[PDB]
Amino acid sequence: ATGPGIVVIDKPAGMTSHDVVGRCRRIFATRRVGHAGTLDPMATGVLVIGIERATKILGLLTAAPKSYAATIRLGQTTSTEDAEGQVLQSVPAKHLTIEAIDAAMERLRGEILEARPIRIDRFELLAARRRDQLIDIDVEIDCSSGTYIRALARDLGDALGVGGHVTALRRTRVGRFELDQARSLDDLAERPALSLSLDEACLLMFARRDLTAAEASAAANGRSLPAVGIDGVYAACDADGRVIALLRDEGSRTRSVAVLRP
């Protein structure tokens, strides 16, 4: 009933990204639902959902930069590298200083089936608390993907010689979408609404090209148009501002990325 669009969800802890999609299928009374990239079950925070034909732009959202707030427990390793597993190795971290921790964090910035390059762009220390023999640190991580944040925490613990694991993980950003635009699933169930319509999401994210009636008919069929030198994927709109297709300029001709209004 809402039409196509995107919804920014604040995922609850423990829930899979698949099951969020499941709940949205029920909420929006449709089977055409997808997400723009998994968020770890133990994590909370930003998960971007597409409804109806907005599923066709999900791939353009998946490589977006991400930011996380995390807590790492120094002094203990666990079987899962998070607080859900049993403690395996336990040694006091009490000798560690802010200087030592911060320096080891700085050192872990950089680039880490086919092997994929994962960038840890930022690894910033916010706070540190003593918990008897252990140290809990609150951190912020900017990365291309959060898939190996557990490994990062383990690597930090390893670097400091005390071991580490993640006790809290919260995604604060996916591309343009932060937690201030995110709603809870109960909030969404109460009043089902999109964050943005598909038109709104494309016009926010991409460059824009207004098409004549002739160009608009050709775009709706996925046929090529003359290129105008636009840089990157762009929204090709009709006279009414409706986004017909997402295109890319390649030399003198366009190539269709996705047809949104066939």
Side-chain angles (χ1 to χ4, degrees), residues 1-111 114-262:
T2 58
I6 60 161
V7 51
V8 185
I9 288 161
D10 182 4
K11 189 184 83 58
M15 197 181 274
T16 64
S17 299
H18 185 250
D19 283 341
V20 175
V21 163
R23 284 268 186 87
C24 287
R25 283 203 177 111
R26 281 234 221 233
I27 283 162
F28 290 96
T30 181
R31 244 194 5 227
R32 200 169 182 170
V33 181
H35 68 78
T38 190
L39 175 62
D40 199 276
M42 72 91 152
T44 57
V46 182
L47 180 71
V48 180
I49 298 284
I51 307 297
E52 305 287 339
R53 287 205 189 255
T55 50
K56 300 174 115 173
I57 73 152
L58 290 174
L60 301 169
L61 283 150
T62 184
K66 290 140 190 105
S67 296
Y68 291 82
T71 298
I72 298 172
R73 178 102 89 195
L74 297 170
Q76 282 172 342
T77 62
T78 63
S79 58
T80 54
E81 328 209 288
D82 62 39
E84 294 288 80
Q86 306 252 354
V87 171
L88 294 176
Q89 301 301 318
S90 197
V91 69
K94 58 204 176 172
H95 56 298
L96 296 183
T97 59
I98 293 303
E99 249 188 309
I101 293 165
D102 210 10
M105 287 170 65
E106 166 65 25
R107 185 113 254 152
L108 285 167
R109 297 175 176 231
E111 59 141 37
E114 291 192 317
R116 63 197 282 240
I118 303 287
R119 247 280 228 179
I120 301 306
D121 287 303
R122 196 172 130 254
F123 198 11
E124 184 175 339
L125 183 61
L126 301 185
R129 308 162 257 120
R130 293 204 184 268
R131 291 296 117 153
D132 201 349
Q133 307 295 288
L134 313 161
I135 300 179
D136 285 339
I137 60 169
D138 296 340
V139 304
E140 277 179 348
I141 303 153
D142 290 336
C143 49
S144 48
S145 133
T147 314
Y148 310 100
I149 284 185
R150 276 188 197 82
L152 181 67
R154 167 202 78 212
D155 291 342
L156 180 61
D158 278 12
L160 292 159
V162 296
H165 70 277
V166 180
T167 59
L169 193 52
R170 185 148 175 77
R171 187 148 76 186
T172 60
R173 183 193 277 289
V174 176
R176 300 186 181 248
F177 304 112
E178 292 200 288
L179 285 166
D180 64 350
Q181 308 143 73
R183 323 131 150 167
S184 79
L185 281 178
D186 93 273
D187 218 290
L188 203 54
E190 205 126 56
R191 38 227 222 99
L194 306 160
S195 297
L196 294 165
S197 78
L198 178 55
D199 280 344
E200 286 169 341
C202 295
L203 291 172
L204 169 77
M205 284 172 67
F206 311 112
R208 175 188 177 145
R209 183 189 179 169
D210 295 327
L211 310 181
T212 23
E215 299 175 330
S217 46
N221 293 287
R223 291 157 170 270
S224 57
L225 329 170
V228 292
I230 300 164
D231 185 11
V233 180
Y234 64 90
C237 301
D238 60 16
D240 307 347
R242 286 203 191 260
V243 184
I244 298 130
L246 301 181
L247 310 177
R248 262 203 198 264
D249 279 352
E250 303 201 333
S252 286
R253 298 298 290 180
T254 66
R255 151 221 258 204
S256 194
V257 172
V259 171
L260 297 188
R261 300 198 102 250

